[PDB]
Coordinates of all heavy atoms in Angstrom, one line a residue:
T5 N -0.4 8.9 -1.1 CA -1.1 8.8 -2.5 C -1.5 10.2 -3.0 O -2.2 10.9 -2.2 CB -2.0 7.6 -2.6 OG1 -3.2 8.2 -3.2 CG2 -2.3 6.7 -1.5
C6 N -0.8 10.6 -4.0 CA -0.9 11.8 -4.7 C -1.8 11.5 -6.0 O -1.1 11.5 -7.0 CB 0.4 12.4 -5.1 SG 1.5 12.8 -3.7
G7 N -3.1 11.7 -5.9 CA -3.9 11.3 -7.0 C -3.8 9.8 -7.3 O -4.2 9.2 -6.2
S8 N -3.2 9.4 -8.3 CA -3.0 8.1 -8.9 C -1.5 7.7 -8.6 O -1.2 6.5 -8.9 CB -3.1 8.2 -10.5 OG -4.4 8.6 -10.8
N9 N -0.7 8.6 -8.2 CA 0.7 8.3 -7.9 C 0.9 7.8 -6.4 O 0.3 8.4 -5.6 CB 1.6 9.5 -8.2 CG 1.6 9.7 -9.7 OD1 1.5 8.9 -10.5 ND2 1.8 11.0 -10.0
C10 N 1.6 6.7 -6.3 CA 2.0 6.0 -5.0 C 3.3 6.2 -4.6 O 4.3 5.7 -5.4 CB 1.6 4.5 -5.3 SG 1.6 3.5 -3.9
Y11 N 3.6 6.5 -3.4 CA 4.9 6.7 -2.9 C 5.1 6.1 -1.5 O 4.1 6.1 -0.7 CB 5.3 8.2 -2.7 CG 5.2 9.0 -4.0 CD1 4.2 10.0 -4.1 CD2 6.0 8.8 -5.0 CE1 4.0 10.8 -5.3 CE2 5.9 9.4 -6.2 CZ 4.9 10.4 -6.3 OH 5.0 11.1 -7.5
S12 N 6.2 5.5 -1.3 CA 6.6 4.8 0.0 C 7.5 5.9 0.7 O 7.8 7.0 -0.1 CB 7.5 3.6 -0.2 OG 8.8 4.0 -0.9
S13 N 7.7 5.8 1.8 CA 8.5 6.6 2.7 C 10.0 6.8 2.2 O 10.6 7.8 2.2 CB 8.7 6.0 4.1 OG 7.4 6.4 4.7
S14 N 10.4 5.7 1.5 CA 11.7 5.7 1.0 C 11.8 6.6 -0.2 O 12.7 7.3 -0.6 CB 12.2 4.2 0.6 OG 11.2 3.6 -0.2
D15 N 10.6 6.6 -1.0 CA 10.7 7.5 -2.3 C 10.8 9.0 -1.8 O 11.4 9.8 -2.5 CB 9.3 7.3 -2.9 CG 9.1 6.0 -3.5 OD1 10.1 5.4 -4.0 OD2 7.9 5.7 -3.7
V16 N 10.1 9.2 -0.6 CA 10.0 10.5 -0.1 C 11.4 11.0 0.5 O 11.9 12.1 0.2 CB 8.8 10.6 0.9 CG1 8.9 11.9 1.7 CG2 7.5 10.5 0.2
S17 N 12.0 10.1 1.1 CA 13.3 10.4 1.7 C 14.4 10.6 0.6 O 15.3 11.4 0.8 CB 13.8 9.3 2.7 OG 12.9 8.8 3.6
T18 N 14.2 9.9 -0.4 CA 15.1 10.0 -1.5 C 15.1 11.3 -2.2 O 16.3 11.8 -2.5 CB 15.1 8.8 -2.5 OG1 15.5 7.6 -1.7 CG2 16.0 8.8 -3.7
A19 N 13.9 11.7 -2.6 CA 13.7 13.0 -3.2 C 14.1 14.2 -2.3 O 14.7 15.2 -2.8 CB 12.1 13.2 -3.4
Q20 N 13.8 14.1 -1.1 CA 14.0 15.1 -0.1 C 15.5 15.2 0.1 O 16.1 16.3 0.1 CB 13.3 14.7 1.2 CG 13.4 15.7 2.4 CD 12.9 15.4 3.7 OE1 13.3 16.0 4.7 NE2 12.1 14.3 3.9
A21 N 16.3 14.1 0.2 CA 17.7 14.2 0.4 C 18.3 15.1 -0.8 O 19.2 15.9 -0.5 CB 18.5 12.8 0.5
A22 N 17.8 14.8 -1.9 CA 18.2 15.4 -3.3 C 18.0 16.9 -3.3 O 18.9 17.8 -3.5 CB 17.6 14.6 -4.4
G23 N 16.8 17.3 -2.9 CA 16.2 18.7 -2.8 C 17.0 19.4 -1.8 O 17.3 20.6 -2.0
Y24 N 17.3 18.9 -0.6 CA 18.0 19.5 0.4 C 19.4 19.8 0.1 O 20.0 20.9 0.4 CB 17.9 18.7 1.7 CG 18.4 19.5 2.9 CD1 17.5 20.6 3.3 CD2 19.6 19.3 3.4 CE1 18.1 21.5 4.4 CE2 20.1 20.1 4.6 CZ 19.3 21.1 5.0 OH 19.6 21.9 6.0
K25 N 20.1 18.9 -0.6 CA 21.5 19.1 -0.9 C 21.7 20.3 -2.0 O 22.6 21.1 -1.9 CB 22.4 18.0 -1.2 CG 23.0 17.8 -2.6 CD 21.7 17.5 -3.6 CE 22.2 16.4 -4.5 NZ 21.1 16.3 -5.6
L26 N 20.7 20.4 -2.9 CA 20.8 21.5 -3.8 C 20.5 22.8 -3.0 O 21.1 23.7 -3.4 CB 19.8 21.2 -5.0 CG 20.3 20.7 -6.3 CD1 19.5 19.4 -6.6 CD2 19.8 21.7 -7.3
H27 N 19.7 22.7 -2.1 CA 19.3 23.9 -1.3 C 20.5 24.3 -0.6 O 20.8 25.5 -0.4 CB 18.1 23.5 -0.3 CG 17.9 24.7 0.7 ND1 18.2 24.6 2.0 CD2 17.4 25.9 0.3 CE1 17.9 25.8 2.4 NE2 17.4 26.6 1.5
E28 N 21.1 23.4 0.1 CA 22.4 23.7 0.9 C 23.5 24.3 -0.1 O 24.3 25.1 0.4 CB 23.0 22.6 1.6 CG 22.4 21.7 2.6 CD 23.3 20.3 2.5 OE1 24.2 20.5 1.6 OE2 23.4 19.4 3.3
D29 N 23.6 23.8 -1.2 CA 24.5 24.2 -2.3 C 24.1 25.4 -3.1 O 25.0 26.0 -3.8 CB 24.9 23.0 -3.2 CG 25.7 22.0 -2.7 OD1 26.1 22.0 -1.5 OD2 25.7 20.9 -3.4
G30 N 22.9 26.0 -2.9 CA 22.5 27.2 -3.6 C 22.4 26.9 -5.1 O 22.4 27.8 -5.9
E31 N 22.1 25.6 -5.4 CA 21.9 25.2 -6.8 C 20.4 25.0 -7.0 O 19.6 24.6 -6.1 CB 22.8 24.0 -7.1 CG 24.2 24.2 -7.6 CD 25.4 23.6 -7.3 OE1 25.3 22.8 -6.2 OE2 26.4 23.6 -8.0
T32 N 20.0 25.3 -8.3 CA 18.6 25.1 -8.7 C 18.4 24.3 -9.9 O 19.4 24.2 -10.8 CB 18.2 26.6 -9.0 OG1 17.4 27.1 -8.0 CG2 17.9 26.9 -10.4
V33 N 17.5 23.5 -10.1 CA 17.3 22.7 -11.4 C 16.0 23.0 -11.9 O 15.0 23.1 -11.2 CB 17.7 21.3 -11.2 CG1 16.6 20.3 -11.0 CG2 18.4 20.9 -12.4
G34 N 15.8 22.9 -13.3 CA 14.5 23.1 -13.8 C 14.1 24.5 -14.2 O 14.8 25.5 -13.7
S35 N 13.0 24.7 -15.0 CA 12.6 25.9 -15.5 C 11.9 26.6 -14.3 O 11.7 27.9 -14.6 CB 11.6 25.9 -16.6 OG 12.4 25.7 -17.8
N36 N 11.5 25.9 -13.4 CA 10.8 26.5 -12.2 C 11.9 26.8 -11.1 O 11.4 27.1 -10.0 CB 9.7 25.6 -11.5 CG 8.6 25.4 -12.6 OD1 7.6 24.7 -12.3 ND2 8.7 26.1 -13.8
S37 N 13.0 26.4 -11.4 CA 14.2 26.6 -10.4 C 13.9 25.9 -9.0 O 13.7 26.6 -8.1 CB 14.4 28.1 -10.2 OG 15.1 28.7 -11.3

Side-chain angles (χ1 to χ4, degrees):
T5 126
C6 298
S8 302
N9 292 330
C10 192
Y11 302 114
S12 62
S13 285
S14 52
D15 292 328
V16 166
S17 314
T18 294
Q20 186 188 163
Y24 191 75
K25 117 286 229 194
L26 263 125
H27 170 248
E28 309 160 347
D29 293 350
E31 272 138 339
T32 251
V33 95
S35 282
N36 299 174
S37 285

